[PDB]
Amino acid sequence: MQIFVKTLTGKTITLEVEPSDTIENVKAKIQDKEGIPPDQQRLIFAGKQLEDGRTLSDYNIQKESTLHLVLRLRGG
Template structure:
């Protein structure tokens, strides 16, 4: 198992030890959604001071379940909308630097 700490408490997620290295951040978020009912889009996971990206694995970040803890930030729905709006503006305005 490994621990996830968030404002509401601490959650221990059980995962076979051999699967920990290949467990993606998106998979962890899906497990958290099932456990605490927070949509994946509102979850931000942090480890060692950096936000974890969905496509990466715990191993990519050097995470060890026997000594490390993940930190979960739950963003409000309004913050989620702001983030999505900013991301869409960046992607639609990116043509200015194209060749």
């Protein structure tokens, strides 16, 4: 399944992942493309932060959805 990722810079990028992918493996995909360490990024959906070791299936995230990519800093 594919989806779109939106950052604070208003950048939109599409990623290919499996519904059984772990928040880790997925972060790895993000790091590989954005080169941003996973320890500096946080992923949130449905107002909830994804926990490490869990699969997407855990979080009813279906195909073609918008994921929120937040950096280490909460904001300005």
